[PDB]
Structure formats: C-alpha cells, structure tokens
Symmetry: D2
C-alpha cells in the first residue's frame, strides 16, 4: 500500500515519459504540503476570525500590499495577523508560525521612491520578516532597499519582484544580491508580450532552483475565485504547473484581499500543491540538482547533500534539522528531498522566514533549557519527533535523518545521523 | 554556413542543453520563434463565429479544425455552419500562400446505457455531410467506441474517432479506450466535475503521455482562455495553461465558449497561435527524442523504420522540413510521433486525409490536385517538387536548405520505405 | 523468435545501465554477427608461403603488414607477389572473394628529426608496388605526416596514411597528428619503452576514444598474443587484452611476431577472430550509439546525414546489414563511425577502396567486377543484388531479414543521399 | 565549469589536473576516454589489494619484508603443493616480517594470510585432504580461504563445516573455475564472502575466448552485491623470467581494476619467479593509474540506482558518507569498525576517498584488505572509561595516522563514520571535519 500512494509508481519511472504515463488520480498524497501559500491581506481577509480560518486553511505568509492603504491600516492588519497566529500558541507541538511580508508600492516613474523609504522604515519598526521589492531592475535597486532597512533590518529577507524586460535581462545580477525572487506576472505580462511570460517564469524558477534561493510564483493563479466558488481548469493547471516548475511559494492577491472566497482560494491552492508535489519526478530532479550544485568545502553544504541522499536511500519520513538562522534547513531544501525538512529553531523570525523554502516545516522551540549542551540538542531533536508524530509527519518504525552541528551558534552544522522512530 | 543568429533563435541554446535544469535556465524571452506553429487549433462554432466573414478571419488567425457542438442546435443549424465553414475555406483557393484545409469535427451530445438515439442520428448526419472527425462524448469503455464506429455505418469508416475522457471510469479504462480509438480529448470541463478539480492536471498529463507513447493524437480542451469570453486579454493562468498543454505533448488545443459565444473569438484564436509557437520552440527535444526512441518498440514495419531514420536525419542537419507523400496520412502520423523540430509537409491527393492530419502535431497538409502522370516515378517527383515550391512560397524553405524526403517503392498506401536528403535548388 | 533475443548478448545489450549490462553477459550467448574488427597479420618467414597465406585469408586475415625494419626491397616484393597470388586464387568465385589490403610499415626516423632517406626509398617502393596503406613509424607532429605524403608523390595520393604513435611527443601532439592522418596505430612496443609501461593503457584508451570521436580508423598493436609465437594457446592476459582492445573501440587488431616468425600463425589469426566476435557482441550499443550521436557535430553533408539516418533505421528493425555502394569507401566509413550492430556490406568497383575499407570496423568489402549497365538505375540494382547474394552465401543474410540500402542520386563519388528499407526475398 | 569554479580557485588548477580529474568530470564515457592523460599523475593511495603467492622465491623473512614494502597486502599459501610443515614455516616467516614493522603503530601495515585449497579433484565434493588442510588453517589462524572448484552452494557449506566452530570468522572466497560454477554463480555468491575469477582452470574448462565475459560478469555481480572479487592468474606471467611485463599483461591488470576487481593476484610471478618484488611493484604502479581512470561520475550513479532501498542504518550512513566525500573532494573517510562491515559498505560505493578503517580486531584489520580502498589501522590502546572519549581517541588516531602516512594534510576535509552505541552493527553517524 505504501508503494501505491504519493505517486510512487510514477516516482520510480526510468524516463520522464514513463513518469507521465504512471500518474494516477487514485494515488493519494501522503506527505505534508511543502509549497508555501502567500495570501494578500485586505478587506476580505483582515478580521481576526477570518485570519484564523485562513491559517487553518494553509496560509503560511501574510502579504501586505503597500500600494494602497495607510500606515495605520497596515499596523492594524499586522496586529490582527499576530492575534490570530498567537491564538494557537497554547499547544506548542502544533503551533504554526506565519510570516509577514511587506510588498512595496515601487519606484513609479522614478530608483527608490520616498514613499518606499518610509514604508520600509515602517516595516522594520513593526518587525516584518520579508520585503517583496517591487519593480527591481538591477543590483543597485536591491542595495537601495537594503540600505533603507537600516542596521535594525539586517535580518529581513529581500525578495526581488521581476516585473519588466530589464529585470529579466539583468536577472543574474539581481538574484546574486537578493534573498529570492518573485515572478510578478501581472506587470510582467503587460511589460513583455503575454505569450512570453511562461518562458520568463520557467527560466527564473530554474535559475533560483540552481542557486538554492526561494522563488515565488504570483498573480491571477486562481483569479476567477474572486467572484466564483470554484476555479477554472486553466487556474488549477497553473497552480500545479508552478509547483512542478519548482516554485517554493505560490501567491494569492485579489483572491484573498478583496474576493468573496478568500478561505476557499487558500484551500484550493493547498489541495493542488499537495497533488503536484507528489507528481514531481524526484529521480531526475535530484540527479540534476545534485550534479549542478557546485563542489564545496563548507561543512553545512556537504552535510546537506549527504543527508538528502541518505533520506532518499531509506524512504525517510523527515530530515530533522537544528537551525538558528534557517540556513541549514535552506541547504537541505535546495536538493528537493521528498522527506519533510522539520526545522527546530528558537528564533521566532527564522521560523517565519523558512516558509520561503519549499518543504521546510518550522517548529518554534519553547521548552526549558538543559544545562548540558549535548542534552539540549537531544531534547530539541526529541521535540521535532514529538511534533512530527502529532502532525502526521512521523510514525513509530519510520527512519529519520537528523542534522546537527558540533558546537553552539550558527554556521557549525556538520553531522548527519540515521534514527529509528520510537 | 548558417550563422550565429540562426543558433540564437527558436530557443536553440535551451535545445542544446545537457540537462532539463540547464534547458530551463537557458529559455530566453528574446529568442524568437521561427518555425510554423505545429499544434493545431480547434475552434467551436456558434453565434459568435458562424458568419462566413467571421470564419475567414478565424482561418487567417490560425483555426485548423471547426468543432460543431451537437449538444445544442438542430441539424439545419449545423448544416448551415458546415456550409459557412466550407465557403470561408474555399474563398482562399485562389491564393496558394493562404489556402489551407480546415477539418470539420462533430462533437456528440453523449449518452443512459448504450449509444443514445440522438447520437445515432447525429452520427448519421455527420457521415451524410462528410465530417472528418467525431469527438465522442463521455467514452467510458472500449464498447462505447465500438458503438460509435458501428453508427458511422457503411460510408463513414474513414472518419476519425477521438474519444472524450470526461469521468473517473474513462480515466481508469483509458488503455482499452485508446487501443480502439484514433485519439483522445482531455475534456476537462466534465472531468473537473466528475473527479476532484485538483486532480485534473494528473489525468491530463497521464493521458497526453500515454497518447504520445502510442503515437495517437491528443487534444487538450476547456477553459484554456475562459476570461476571453468577455475580456480582450487572458489571465496569466490562461496563457500558462495553453503553454503547458503544448509542453505536456498535446497535438491540438481547443477553444469552446471563447469562440462559440464570446466577444473576442478571433483574438482567442490569435492568442492560442502566439502561445503555441513560443511553447513549441521551448520543447526539450534532446531528451524528448531519446525517450520517444527508447519507448517505441522495435519494428519491422518499413514505414515506422523510415520515419525514425528521417526524424534522426532531420535533427542531424537542422532540416527546415520533412516532405512526405501520404494517401491516408499514416506516414505523416508516424513522423509526427517522434516530435521532429522540422515541419512535416504532407503531400496528399485525399482531401479528407489533408483535413484529418491537422490532428497530428507538426503536420502541414498540402492537397495535390494535378492529374496523374503516366510514369509513376514522374508523378512522385512532381509531388515532391510541389511540396518544395509550396514550402518556398510559405517561408519554410529557401534555396540551399536541406530537406528530408520520405516516399515508398510502389504506388498505394502502406509501402513507405525511402528517405532521401535533398538540397533545395 | 525468443531464440533470437537470447543470442549475441542481446539481454546485456538491452540493459538500462552499464552495471546491469556487465551482470547480464552470458558465456552461453553465442555470437551471430560476422566479425567486424579487422585483423592485420605481419608477413614473415612463418607466413610467406602462398599455401600458408591461403589458410591465413580463410582464418580471417584482412590486412597483410610488411615490416620494412627487416628485409630488402627484393624480399618485400616477393612478399607482395605471394600475398596477391593467394588473394587472387579465390577470385574465380566473386560472391565469396575476400579483398586483402597490403600495408607498408616504415623503419622510421631513427636518431634523425624527420623523414629518413631509407623511408623515402621505401615509400617510393610502396607506391611503385601499389600498397594500400602506410603505417608511418614514430610520428611526432603534423609535419611528419606531410613529409610522408610528399614522399608518396603524385601517384600515391590514394594511399592511406596511418600514423604510429610511439612516444610522449606523439601522444602530446595527438590532435594535430590525427587531423592530417587517415588514422592511427597505438604502437605499444615502443610506446611502452618511451613512456612508463603502466601508463600505456591510458594512451591506448585516449587515442581509441579520440579516433572514434573523429570517425577515423584506429589500430591496437604489439604483444596481443605474444606467447602464441611458441605456444599453441595464449595466456589469460592475452585473450583479455584482445577483448579489451575491441571493447575500447579499436577498428583493427594486429599480430606481429605471432604471424611473422612464430610456429602458430594461422592459429593466432583464428584466436583473434574468435575473441573479436565475442567482444563485439559484448559492446554496450545502447550507451555507445547515444554518445556517438551526441558527440558527432551537426552536418549539412548528405552522405553524413544519410549515414546517421541509416544506422538509426538499422537499430530500429534489427537489420542484418546495411548495404552501401561506395567508390572511395567514404559512405561506408561514415556508417561505420556510428558503430551499427548491422554489418556494413560495402559494394565497390575500386579494388583499392575494397582493400582499404578493412581499416573501418564492421565494413565488409565486396569487389564488383561487372562492367557498367547501360541504364544507371539497373547498374545500381545489380550491385545491391550482388551484396545480397554475397551476404546470403557468406551467412550475413537470410530470407526474411530486413536490410538498409544506402545509395546516391547520380553516378560518381560524393552523392550518397538515399536510405531504403528492404526485405530479403 | 560553474560546478567546479569555486573549488578550482580554492584548491588550485594543479589539483584539478592530477588523478585524471578532467576525465572524472566528463559528461559522457566517450569524453571520459578522450580526456585520459598520461601526464595526469595519480595522487591517491593504491586501493586494489595485491595478493602474492608464497613460494621458494618469496619465502625468506628478508624477501617478505621487501614484498610488504612493495605493496603485498595478502599472502596466498597454495595447498596444491608443499606439506603442512612447509606451510607453517611460510606463515611464521610472513608473521615475523609483518611484526618487524609493529614498533610504530601509526604506520604498521597488516597483512592477511589466505589458504588456497587443493580442491575436490575427480570427487563430487569436499576431499579428505581439504578437510585436513582447512583444519590446519583454523589451527594456524588463517584469515581467508580461497576454496578451489566451487560448483554450487553446498560446496561452500561443506568448507564452512570443515572450518568448525573455531573458524566462523574466516572469510570464504569461492573460486569459480568451470562452466557449472559460472552457471550457478548467484547461489554460490549468496553463501560466500566473495569470489575469485580463477582464470587458469576457467580458461581450460570453457573456451579461452569466453573467459573475459565470465570475468566481467562475475566482477559486475560482486560489485552489485557489495562482496569482494579477486582477479587471478597470468596477470604478469612473463615477469617470472623478465624484468618488464608484456603490453597485454599491463593492459590485463589495468582492465581488471577498471572492471571493478577488489583484489589482483600474482601466482608464479611471486612464488617461483626471478622478479617477485618487481612483480608486486608493477601491479602497484598499474593499479594506482587504473584507479584514477575509473569513471566515478557514472559508476557512483549506477551503484546508487542499483543498490536497493535500505532501512539498515550502516548502509544508509555509508551512501551519505560517500556522497559527502565526493561533494568536497575529501581525502579520506575515517570509519570505526569491529568486524570490517561498516568499511565494506563504504567500499561498495567506490569512493575516490580512501576508507581509513580503525579497528581493535587484528583479524578484521587483515581481512578488510579484500575490499577495495580500505586502509586498515590496528588500534592497540585499552578502552577509555567514557565510551564517547574512547570513540574520539580512535577518530584522532585515524587522523594522526592519516597525516603521518600522507593521506591527510592540514586544510583537508575528512568524513567520519561512527555509531551510537558499542558493539558491531550500530553505525549511524556521518560527520564532516576540517583537518587542523
Ligand atoms: O521536454 S521533455 O524532454 N521534458 C523532460 C523533463 C521534465 C521534467 C523533469 S524533472 O521533473 O525531473 C525536473 C524539473 C525541474 C528541474 O529543474 C529539473 O532539473 C528536473 C525532467 C525532465 C519531455 C516531455 C514530455 C515527454 O513525454 C518526454 O518524454 C520528455
Ligand atoms: O560501452 S560503452 O557504451 N560504455 C562503457 C562504460 C560505461 C561506464 C563505465 S563506468 O566506469 O562508469 C562503470 C564501470 C563498471 C560498472 O560496474 C559501472 O556500473 C560503471 C565504464 C564503461 C562505450 C564505449 C566506448 C565509448 O567511446 C562510448 O562512448 C561508450
Ligand atoms: O542553520 P544555522 O543557522 O547555521 O544553525 C545551525 C546551528 O545549530 C546547532 O545545531 C545548534 O546550535 P545552538 O545550540 O546554538 O542552537 C549548531 O550546532 C549549528 O551550528
Ligand atoms: O502514408 P500512406 O497512406 O501509407 O501512403 C504512403 C504511400 O505514398 C506513396 O509514397 C506514393 O503512392 P501513390 O503514388 O499511390 O500516391 C507510396 O509509395 C507509399 O506507400
Ligand atoms: O562513398 P563514395 O565514394 O562517396 O561513393 C558513393 C557513390 O556511389 C554511388 O552510389 C554509385 O555511383 P557509381 O554508379 O558511380 O558507382 C553514387 O550514387 C554515390 O555518390
Ligand atoms: O563495522 P561494525 O563491525 O558494524 O562496527 C561498527 C561499530 O563500531 C563502533 O563505532 C564503535 O564500537 P566499539 O566501541 O564496540 O568498538 C560502534 O558504534 C559501531 O556499531
Ligand atoms: O506586483 C505584482 O505582484 C505583479 O505585478 O504581479
Ligand atoms: O465536453 C467537453 O469538451 C468537456 O466536458 O470539457
Ligand atoms: O612499431 C610498432 O609496431 C610498435 O612499437 O609497437
Ligand atoms: O586455481 C587457480 O587460481 C586458477 O585456475 O586460476
Ligand atoms: K505593491
Ligand atoms: K457536446
Ligand atoms: K617498422
Ligand atoms: K590450489
Ligand atoms: Mg506589479
Ligand atoms: Mg463534456
Ligand atoms: Mg615501433
Ligand atoms: Mg585452479
């Protein structure tokens, strides 16, 4: 029964043609949904009661669109998101962190606009986790956003939105200085011919996957759901194909900000993403990602490939990783393991930000400390196991890969262990 | 000899990539398509696309197959639609550069237990009016196809039956349905109501993959550019859906309400044409050809052997086209199954085969009407030169280009066994 | 039949990985194809008798090597006359006649920097006595090949020059040497003294790989069956060395003292024949064909385009042979470079091209003696039928087999452009 | 180039020109062959073990010391000739020569002793002489048995029974010497510790022109199973009387290594020939060149794809460690092992990195020479009070021995493989360490 579920016959295929021929509508997904959902906050999704239903439906990142709305309005949206998120903190083994992303208005007819400088300052003061920087055309645009975040915003992730021809042509220099990319198809589809957007999307997703940096697919994914309870056949296909392309995150704009079915739109993206993730051809994908990732003498990089290889060898249910900044979890995610990457961290911000990386499931550690560092490490790993069991990630008899480091502090991951559950 | 500009166009850097990851990384929005659009467009006829003048604009925009939906309208209404399509098509017989065969497909109302009485009468109407194809609704098993075949009677055995898979049973019994059908339609409208909406992409990708393996035409249908029923431009999800259906391996793409009742029928056809051309250049031929080659069983049929040799030869010289002589369309279909980048120019005397080969990706039909030469070898040579001169006129070929030419050793269907490499003079 | 798929290592040939290919090799799977790697036998006191040469031709000798390091011009002229008498003793049966090339192996430069005066005289003797090939000793750079070519004069333009790589400089300047040579000999005797003995296998494997990439003949030479100079059976290392030279990709394998002075010249030829046939069936064609196609550059030459299409077609139908008409041998050489499993039966009127094509693996030359027919298409057909009749008599072909026939559109060399699938009747 | 650009800047262009690294990074086997370079010098320690047959030319203690220095890893005693007294003296001379280097534990080289049986002769199974010789083997503490003329699984069960309860730790390598042994290979390999392709008798039992097919098939199946395979007979035959081998002989040695043989053997070349030490040196020189010429890119991919999914943590850790070693061009993989099994599971994936196996078992240290690329280090210190400290001291002993022997340099990355509790069978940890 195990080998019939999660498209495993299609996963074991010798060719991509045979992989397609073996896809089965009766093969049910088993793994947890790995592609994060970004939902735009607006009149349809601002109330605390509404935000609780959206978190339960699968929202991982709340996007604030600063093109419209005053600072007072956005501060109230942030407070409502935080109230809804913290209403589930009473059960630490099931608590789900939710990131807050600030999407800038943009340069308009201008580099960095004066309104963007003020909005980025607001973002730092209100503790936002991510910035979706609008209309990024070159590396100096990213440097300007970084400077506007100041010394207190050094930890905020900058996701550059590629929205025009120049952004596509200067993609490599933009990606190099950004934490990730958003394929902002709305403006891109007006700036370049509509029939070419899929080429830009597939190229940018491919280059982000090669670089091991998060990539978001955005705009009109389930557009008809703004007024209708069910999406079109093209919309479900678009969501599935964005996941198959390699997108780390998928996004909802008007569907959740102003539409009549915000919760249903989140549920639909969750249902499609789970089905599409099981349909990924891991046999060729892992081989290509492994071959393309450069040779490295960084122990975190070396441990990550060894751990993902070990996970595939034993059909591991999960890779449990201890991380301070999220980096060790991101390096595991870049190889696209089928095994869930359960990231145990004490940092509330890193727990929110790792939603940008496909297949990273953040767990915020709030248990009492242990006097012996090795005992504290073991307890965090056992916490990952208990949370995994409660959430359905793990069962007794499963094998897990555990990734830790040799000393406290970030940057010292160098150990991979094979553990039997219970 | 060809120049650096040649190797920058039609996504050729992405085509030469050693891995699918590098293929994706090399896709370029500035690399313009050069080849003729190979995925056929099926447009549904209705109030928005019925007039002769509107049909002429749709043919110019790229419509290859006209679909008549027998779920609505009387036999009198459909006979007038067929006459209007034929009048619009024949209005171009004056210009060789613009005249093109256009197939007529009858889409049945559907089943109740066996074939409905209305379907028996509509299938009989199809034979009497010389339709080329039947899109059989709600096919659930092999006996459903046999019943449609029997209803095509003594005169309509040459009509192609494309089975529409619209429910769970059709998906589960897919292999037995494909075995007795000429091709398949992924009818996503009903399929998306019969099975969970989030599973339709799996059924679409599986059926396209299995049809490509079998070398039989597959159509992707329904809501591809839905918003264009009321808006002049489609959504980002809609352009993506069209591009991904082509990348999946669909031979044809379809428009329903977009052309039957919408406010922008011609613009919907133009949009599908523009996207398909871009998506066809983005196909990863290096791995696709290797996999189609490896999956296709060994064969002692000379047409199949010649087809793989010709497609291999076309890739070796970057041939502009493969010119094939065919009576039934079969030699062109066997070339098409290997997905050559070269256009398959099919020269035929059969007006029906010329219309029907639009079901096969990359087959460009040329109807030949010259009287037969007394010496057979001279009649073969005249048809090959007809394909070359048409190719020159339409922009496929230029003097100095190489073309692959596929013919047989004796007259009649079933004897294709020769591949030649010709330099265009 | 099931028996067909058990023979010639076909289970190991269909394997998905090289590891599985090795695991499926079967000592009970008998070879079926004709032996494709040519055997070069050095002529000497043990092999000069006309009657002994007849037995060597029957055992499988394809090329007779005359080592100009020993013996006078008078001795070598008698060797040539003896070889020709033995070869022509079989000319009375044209369907079974086996051409045999004559190769002159030069003494070399000695302590000099380039072409020695003795080599100038020996090369002139070679042209005057009509030798087919020159094995040029100690080639160190491209100018060494040019000097050999100049010494052959205007009458020796058709002689093939095979450069012997025997030292470090030859290995380092390999690319420039191969570019101007017709082929290469891995001359392991001197190479194993000029560079460390433990590195010779790296030079052999590299040079064979580069010659296969270039589509030019490569010969493996020296001590392959050394112990057979005095013993009736070779060592385990010797049989392994012959098998591995064929698996590496050598077009020819050579015997020196084993046929020139030893007590078992006929047995040494028979042993190389037996090993080569076993090793050729153990070649992993699945990966080899894919790599040769991928590495071979795109081409606008119709002979090259026809060759890849024909080899692809032969693999698709398990063709027993590819019958090719050739004037210079070039059309057969372009088929051979893709390493088909199908035998390349080359029909030619050129007695010299018939001898020289033994340098290309899997090319079986047939010398056609009939004067040209009045109708060129009939002359072409008679030559193809001669290939079929010779193939049937020699065991290459049987009724029911499929063959690929490669011809051109007009008389004269350089116009090959047609591939045809034919059933043997 | 982007996949190796940062590491090329860090390690230098000279590093990437050595050990056939351009040929190793090739995208196809054809390009791999085209890039093989006679000027690309081997760097890694020789991984294919050399078995030398002991006889009149290689019996003295002084001659045995030179053979150990030349690279002999396993001493073969051919019980087809010589009395029990003759073989006991050969064993004593080998042990005296081996123990003459024990004074420096960081450089000591273990040497296995293998007993090669006379065989069944005209009989259907285990002969009476073999029963007595196998009992002698157990009484004299031999590490390995090369069982002659194995034709079926019951032949190996008979050898195992003749070793008795005290010989359970002895490795049985079945010699395949006839058609029946080749046909029943799968059942023989299943119950054996490894195989010897005994080409001398095989080449008389089956057509001589078919032996290469049997050799390549058996090496392939042993590599698939992760069990040692030995290539034997006439590899450097002419070196019995000549100081240099023929071109076919060097080719045969190189091709046995490229085929996948864990061990290569010398018979008359060391037992009775005039150049026993030179024969060992020649096999050492060819094996190092051939090991660098292995196409690891495809070999590793095929070994991973063919190896079935496993829930054994030693197997899972082994593949993770070999993958990690390739990622960073690790100089070595240090593994703690009691029986040799954790080192054998690393060896089956054919890492380019040397597998430095630290063990307290003197017998396991000798037996792991059967597995390609395993370098045994015999640890002689008594156990620490705290087990985690004892584990750490053994890892440091591997690093210190590695540095002293030239395997490891400051700045290198090493992969360390250990287990979660004492005793055999619990390997489950892989660590990446920087050498300081
Ligand atoms: O156009 S193809 O050659 N696409 C191959 C293909 C498609 C997908 C994958 S992936 O899923 O491993 C993958 C996804 C993203 C990556 O960044 C990556 O490195 C690998 C591999 C290969 C094709 C189409 C239809 C066919 O029926 C056919 O046989 C061949
Ligand atoms: O015959 S081939 O298709 N390949 C042989 C090949 C391919 C790969 C390797 S391995 O060294 O990775 C390897 C060795 C042993 C194994 O158990 C294994 O799993 C892999 C060796 C040899 C060939 C020959 C010559 C060519 O020039 C050409 O392009 C192709
Ligand atoms: O992913 P990051 O940010 O590098 O964090 C990984 C770090 O986490 C640890 O596993 C545990 O460290 P702490 O005890 O400081 O939380 C370290 O050993 C390792 O260096
Ligand atoms: O594709 P089909 O229907 O088999 O037709 C291919 C046939 O066309 C030809 O090329 C020409 O035949 P006709 O002259 O009868 O049209 C035949 O030699 C060949 O058998
Ligand atoms: O291989 P080559 O030397 O180019 O010879 C091939 C030539 O042989 C032919 O098939 C027959 O030519 P001939 O009639 O002159 O022998 C030509 O059509 C073709 O050009
Ligand atoms: O390779 P083997 O025989 O399984 O030995 C591996 C064993 O060695 C160890 O690393 C150390 O064990 P000991 O302390 O008993 O020597 C164990 O943790 C592990 O199970
Ligand atoms: O700004 C955006 O999100 C867009 O244009 O898609
Ligand atoms: O009938 C159709 O085309 C459908 O249901 O999609
Ligand atoms: O000259 C030769 O043939 C050699 O050195 O091998
Ligand atoms: O016994 C042996 O070693 C042989 O026959 O090779
Ligand atoms: K915005
Ligand atoms: K209908
Ligand atoms: K000579
Ligand atoms: K013995
Ligand atoms: Mg925008
Ligand atoms: Mg329907
Ligand atoms: Mg020489
Ligand atoms: Mg023996």
């Amino acid at each position: 029964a195990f080998f019939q579920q999660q498209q495993l016959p299609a996963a074991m295929a010798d060719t991509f043609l045979e992989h397609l021929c073996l896809l089965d509508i009766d093969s049910e997904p088993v793994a947890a949904r790995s592609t994060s959902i970004i939902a735009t906050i607006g009149p349809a999704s601002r109330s605390v009661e509404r935000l609780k239903e959206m978190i339960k439906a699968g929202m991982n990142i709340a996007r604030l669109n600063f093109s419209h709305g005053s600072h007072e309005y956005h501060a109230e949206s942030i407070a409502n998101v935080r109230e809804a998120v913290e209403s589930f903190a009473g059960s630490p083994l099931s608590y789900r962190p939710v990131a807050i992303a600030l999407d800038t208005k943009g340069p308009g007819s201008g580099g960095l606009s004066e309104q963007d400088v003020r909005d980025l300052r607001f973002g730092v003061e209100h503790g936002v986790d991510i910035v979706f920087a609008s209309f990024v055309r070159k590396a100096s645009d990213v440097a300007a956003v970084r400077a506007a975040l100041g010394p207190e915003g050094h930890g905020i992730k900058i996701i550059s939105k590629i929205e025009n021809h120049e952004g596509v042509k200067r993609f490599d220099e933009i990606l190099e200085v950004s934490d990730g990319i958003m394929v902002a198809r709305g403006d891109l589809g007006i700036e370049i011919p509509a029939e070419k957007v899929f080429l830009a999307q597939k190229m940018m997703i491919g280059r982000c996957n090669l670089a091991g940096k998060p990539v978001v697919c955005a705009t009109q994914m389930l557009e008809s759901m703004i007024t209708k309870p069910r999406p079109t056949r093209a919309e479900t296909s678009d969501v599935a194909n964005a996941v198959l392309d390699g997108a780390d995150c998928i996004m909802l704009s008007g569907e959740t900000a102003k539409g009549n079915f915000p919760v249903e739109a989140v549920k639909m993206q969750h249902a499609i993403a789970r089905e599409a993730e099981a349909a990924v051809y891991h046999r060729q994908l892992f081989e290509e990602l492994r071959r393309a990732a450069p040779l490295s003498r960084d122990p975190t990089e070396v441990t990550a490939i060894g751990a993902v290889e070990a996970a595939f060898k034993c059909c591991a249910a999960a890779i449990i990783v201890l991380t301070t900044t999220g980096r060790s979890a991101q390096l595991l995610s870049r190889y696209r393991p089928r095994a869930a990457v359960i990231a145990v961290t004490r940092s509330a911000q890193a727990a929110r930000q790792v939603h940008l990386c496909r297949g990273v499931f953040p767990l915020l550690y709030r248990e009492p400390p242990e006097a012996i560092w090795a005992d504290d490490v073991d307890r965090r790993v056992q916490f990952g196991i208990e949370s995994g069991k409660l959430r359905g990630f793990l069962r007794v008899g499963d094998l897990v890969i555990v990734v830790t480091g040799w000393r406290p502090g970030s940057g010292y991951t160098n150990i991979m262990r094979v553990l039997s559950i219970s």
